[PDB]
Amino acid sequence: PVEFSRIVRDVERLIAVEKYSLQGVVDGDKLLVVGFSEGSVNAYLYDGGETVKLNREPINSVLDPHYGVGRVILVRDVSKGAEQHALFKVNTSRPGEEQRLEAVKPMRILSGVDTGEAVVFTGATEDRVALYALDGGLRELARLPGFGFVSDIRGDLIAGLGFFGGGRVSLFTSNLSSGGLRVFDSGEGSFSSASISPGMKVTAGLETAREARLVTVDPRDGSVEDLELPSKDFSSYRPTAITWLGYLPDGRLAVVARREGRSAVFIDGERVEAPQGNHGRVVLWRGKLVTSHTSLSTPPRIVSLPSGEPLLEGGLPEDLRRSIAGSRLVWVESFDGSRVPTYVLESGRAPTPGPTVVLVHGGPFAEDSDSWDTFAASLAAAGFHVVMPNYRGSTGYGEEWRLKIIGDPCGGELEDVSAAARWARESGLASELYIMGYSYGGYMTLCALTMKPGLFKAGVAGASVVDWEEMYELSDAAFRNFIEQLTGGSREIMRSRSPINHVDRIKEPLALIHPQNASRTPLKPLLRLMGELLARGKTFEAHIIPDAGHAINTMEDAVKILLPAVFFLATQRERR
Amino acid sequence: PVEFSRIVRDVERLIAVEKYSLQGVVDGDKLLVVGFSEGSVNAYLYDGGETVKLNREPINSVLDPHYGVGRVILVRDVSKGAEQHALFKVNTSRPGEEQRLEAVKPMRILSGVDTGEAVVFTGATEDRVALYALDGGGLRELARLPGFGFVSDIRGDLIAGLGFFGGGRVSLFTSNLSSGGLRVFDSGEGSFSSASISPGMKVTAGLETAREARLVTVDPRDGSVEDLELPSKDFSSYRPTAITWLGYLPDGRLAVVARREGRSAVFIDGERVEAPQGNHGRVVLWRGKLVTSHTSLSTPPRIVSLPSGEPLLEGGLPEDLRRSIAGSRLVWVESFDGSRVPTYVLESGRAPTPGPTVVLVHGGPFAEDSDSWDTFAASLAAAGFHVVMPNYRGSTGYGEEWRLKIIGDPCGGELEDVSAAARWARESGLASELYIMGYSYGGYMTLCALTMKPGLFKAGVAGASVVDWEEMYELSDAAFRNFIEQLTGGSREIMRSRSPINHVDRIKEPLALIHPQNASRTPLKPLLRLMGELLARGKTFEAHIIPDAGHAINTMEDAVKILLPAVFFLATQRER
Ligand SMILES: [Cl-]
């Protein structure tokens, strides 16, 4: 008999843990860290093993400080839950006292750095996106041709990143005193990060269709060339993504790069030991390195390097923490000999072999990595091993692997998902196999239960795609484009790869979780799918909920969209 | 912000409390009680202080013992909840040791009584219902019955019982233990409800009518009936409408438990004995004193000593939860036509006065809200809601006239009654906000109220609701179709105009639908169409469609499926 209250209690703890993020170093060597709990945000000083809350009421975020500045600039929603924001200054010697910056009209704050003498940010208004600087008074440094974000300032030079068309992130620069704008593209791909050398070049991370590298950009003559670093651990790591980079007050370049779902920290190209997982920015604090850290078993936290010992971390009970027994990355051989990179979270509450869920990510253009995942942790806590396959279409493994999905939905990617199920059983992890996913994952659950009955014992399909053909006609102009690219632009492909048209072949119980009022995950198709299931003798359950929303941060969100899935699987587990 | 885990925890305690029932006196003057917890049944000797568990693995029930027998006959499902039972003997001197009564083929055991020497019972096989006897000489069919039948008492060779032998009433039957046969008597006034055999070997039965109930003696030889005069007149003055149970105690005095207006009363030889307010079960003489079982809207079933009302056996609820369910009373609500609607109220110790109140409408419609333990009402009170339970016209328990007013007027008079109770809630100063919630005919009432009377309730929960009468006929079985034509007068104008699917436009409040996926008498197709109408007409709702909803809530799983969605939804509306 399922332990309903124990599951709810555990899920709540998992939702409620403080998660931390690192923002910089202010005042007299204090960490500026942001703390989240159920997506309520607050800003804190950390030094000498104590914290002090900077804000009063919750905020949205904080603008990046230069090292040492004696104030923090809070960013907060003007009306309740809206896209509009106000800016509020807090002196780090007077924590809790907020002065609104009346010179900023309410607007959508996109990014910002505070030099201590000027606050430079990007915002979007009814009509436009701009680069502002505030001190003098307010000032428009440049109108931007699209959403854009400030990466760093040094002296007068300002460096940033922008979605200015072409399908790729451009680098831009401005000047603090003379304003103006200058945009740099890379044919190869996208700029992902930027910081300004002491020699007044812009060091940037360039992601490509294969591997990432560091370029140097001379802002005055437009010239680019590759940056060679004294130590070569960085080029030898062969990264596919560059999360963040920045020059430290001593002059050294800190870089955090990624490969295969995890990241690594470099200083002037030299690797520095960090706990396994994913990292955020790196700062120099009291002479040592500090960074944030997350993983499939660790909510986001602030650790020191290279000991990896935490400074600030959320609390979980030890049984519950033991229930998440370890995660490895494994490469699963699929139908065509391609290897599917797949994260596995083993559960401390299941035997080996034991109950396993293939938890299929959404998108499809997204990535299962070694980062904290509420769903995965909740399943582990409920006695399920969790298998997370990066099916073709996923991001994080190069452009080639992402593009194989184009024109073959419910084709190659499904074989990948399937290959992971099979690997689960054959390695002797899995005794029983279940499938569960939201968005494109829901679609995969529906495809698997129709195109491959007998593989999974039951499935959970949330926010699933049901019929591609129908979904176009009841869709907006932008999403419609998306659907035609993904389907090659053919009715035979949209019809044959929609699982509503294959409902007859189902032989396993299905759980449907769906929003009642999302325009891009529409209800009318689901109604029809339920009609087909009823009319054809198939057994299922359904939960239709308003304001499903985007992600899960609060316990309410979990009760609506996560607990039905976990309860259904726990119940099926006793039907063996 | 809703306290989800506190609700789940409270509800689980409420589902899990041992609920007691009294069966008889066995052994050396020990009580035989059966205990229910999470739909698990066990049998116990109580003899002052500690209980002793007679069975091993759970059971389904026990057959009724004569005073003093030194054994107990357990009845248990032989298969996985098929209605296939075997009988098991336990000597009272040696609890936990079972001997299976192998002479009896597995069959549906409907009832039994054990004299110490013979075990006499009825059961239902593939083809028939019979009356069996089992002694040292083997098993014998005494009589095959014309319908479902139940043994009530034995004395010497004379067996009395009760049976659904047609004519839309319950008949009295007798047999002989030695020579079998069958005799069947019935009344043009109504139904027999209970039987016991007098010292002189006449059958005393309780006869329920279109109005008031009375005690009769039947001479099983002439078929001659007459009224039983008792020596105290309390019983006739009490003017009962139902007789739950009656029995002759070892001293020859007649105990009778009788009901009027949602509550019952104990009588010994006509004389009323003081008892805790609510409803009571059988009555016995234990160690020279009176003992009976007791339940109310604020007390789970328990064993109590009379006349003090001190509890002998009773389940522990924690103190906070205990206080949340703060007392019930009965009130008479004036309705649209001057008729008074008898209405139970359970106030919450977690609500102010005035405060959030749910009008919790009973199913049926031929059923009754009495002062008896109700998991739904108790959960709502635990979650901070006052609960109003109105016996709308159509209800049973208040005479045949009040039950028949619903015939040909669904979503008519009865709805005004439900509505009247809402209004009384506010006007008396109980309610600050009003909600409606019901299952079966109660779901229909929620749907009717939200369409025919928007602005009255702030939100509603409609579970297992009737949606469209017209459609429900065409997809219903022969017996249920009859029911629908009676209830609707046999007119298409009435079936169409009183189905709330046809009035979906007038809804202005949030609706929660809970519904089974695979119940043939609460079919899904209509609900799917109702959702279509709500989507297509801008209306906001949630829905939960669950397989195997089943009939009642006994296990925590049942509550998770069908109760928690309601409570959670109502708690959320209470903040918005
Ligand atoms: Cl804190």
From Swiss-Prot, chain A:
Gene3D superfamilies the record matches? alpha/beta hydrolase, Peptidase/esterase 'gauge' domain
Q: Which Pfam families match?
A: APH-like_N, Peptidase_S9
- Keyword Cytoplasm, does the record have it? yes
Subcellular locations according to the entry:
Cytoplasm
Q: Where is the chain membrane-spanning?
A: none
Keywords for this protein: Cytoplasm, Hydrolase
The name of this protein is Acylamino-acid-releasing enzyme
From Swiss-Prot, chain B:
Please provide the Gene Ontology terms (biological process) for this protein: proteolysis
Family affiliation = Belongs to the peptidase S9C family.
Q: Does the keyword Cytoplasm apply?
A: yes
The record's EC number reads 3.4.19.1
User: What is this protein for, i.e. what is its function?
Assistant: This enzyme catalyzes the hydrolysis of the N-terminal peptide bond of an N-acetylated peptide to generate an N-acetylated amino acid and a peptide with a free N-terminus.
Q: What is its main location?
A: cytoplasm
Task: Give the InterPro entries listed for this entry.
Answer: AB_hydrolase_fold, APH-like_N, Peptidase_S9_cat
Q: What class of enzyme is it?
A: hydrolase
Q: What is this protein called?
A: Acylamino-acid-releasing enzyme
Reactions performed catalytically: Cleavage of an N-acetyl or N-formyl amino acid from the N-terminus of a polypeptide
Q: What cellular-component terms does GO give this entry?
A: cytoplasm
Q: Which organism is it from?
A: Aeropyrum pernix (strain ATCC 700893 / DSM 11879 / JCM 9820 / NBRC 100138 / K1)
Keyword hit for Hydrolase: yes
The domain of life for this entry's organism is Archaea
Instruction: Cite the entry's keywords alphabetically.
Output: Cytoplasm, Hydrolase
Q: Spell out the subcellular localization from the entry.
A: Cytoplasm
Active site, renumbered: 440, 519, 551
